[PDB]
């Protein structure tokens, strides 16, 4: 268990030379992709991407398919509306992005909800934390906000985020408990790479962990070290787990002063690593 989330991501990209926007939708429980829809794919169905969702019946897949196609048409209409709001030509390609979802705490009760929309990579309109009000980034979005406040939109979203979203999240967590409620602590090790005859890189690896949230920090003689350090962005392994590393350049022979510290939900106490 622990705290958990369900999130849906949507991207629509207009194709002015010919045809409808490219539309891609993905659903996640925590950091696990479990459904997808791609307008360019052959099935034209919401498709499973985790074993525990495949047990849902045909009414589930028919319903999710209908709703995700309805999402795509909303985005198609929005792309046309926004072109007019911003007085842009019909010749350029533009993007709309949407994300919404809910978080639950350790007791699996509703913690927060969100629903955010972007146009051409910038905030457009977002539901506030109260699930009642709207943040509009500019005057175009202010027009949308006035429309949505008159049409009870935030009420419908709040009811979904606090009700349906949390209830189905709990169902998924149960059905997928074998993986969704398992934490994969990072498999850690340290490598050594000379950079001259008298300095070397120490690289501290965290491999095959889940969920993706992690902290790697270097210390020298028990104090935090950022000088001459490098930390890469957490990256997917391709099998559902994640990878990260942090590195520091040190004078050769002084490696024992340096310790790498790893914090992760799957670790009851943080790990400390030191070169041989």
């Amino acid at each position: 268990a622990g705290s958990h989330s369900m999130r849906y991501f949507f991207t629509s990209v207009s194709r002015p030379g010919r045809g409808e926007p490219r539309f891609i939708a993905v659903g996640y429980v925590d950091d696990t992709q479990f459904v997808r829809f791609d307008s360019d794919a052959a099935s034209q169905r919401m498709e499973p991407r985790a074993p525990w969702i495949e047990q849902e019946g045909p009414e589930y897949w028919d319903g999710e398919t209908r709703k995700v196609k309805a999402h795509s048409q909303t985005h198609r209409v929005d792309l046309g509306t926004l072109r007019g709001y911003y007085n842009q030509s019909e010749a350029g390609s533009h993007t709309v992005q949407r994300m919404y979802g809910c978080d639950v705490g350790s007791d699996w009760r509703f913690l927060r909800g969100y629903h955010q929309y972007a146009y051409d990579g910038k905030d457009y309109i977002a539901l506030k934390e109260d699930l009642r009000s709207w943040t509009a980034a500019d005057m175009a979005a202010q027009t949308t906000k006035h429309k949505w406040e008159a049409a009870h939109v935030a009420e419908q979203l709040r009811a979904y985020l606090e009700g349906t979203c949390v209830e189905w999240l709990r169902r998924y967590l149960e059905n997928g408990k074998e993986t969704l409620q398992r934490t994969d602590a990072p498999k850690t090790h340290m490598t050594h790479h000379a950079v001259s005859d008298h300095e070397a890189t120490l690289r501290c690896w965290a491999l095959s962990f889940y969920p993706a949230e992690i902290t790697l920090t270097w210390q020298r003689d028990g104090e935090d070290q950022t000088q001459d350090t490098e930390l890469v962005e957490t990256r997917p392994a391709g099998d559902g787990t994640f990878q990260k590393w942090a590195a520091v350049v040190v004078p050769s022979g002084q490696e024992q002063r340096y310790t790498c510290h790893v914090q992760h939900e799957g670790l009851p106490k943080p790990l400390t690593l030191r070169w041989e």
Partner: peptide
């Protein structure tokens, strides 16, 4: 599951 709303902007 997805929500069943998506009002237009």
């Amino acid at each position: 599951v997805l929500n069943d709303i998506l009002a237009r902007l």
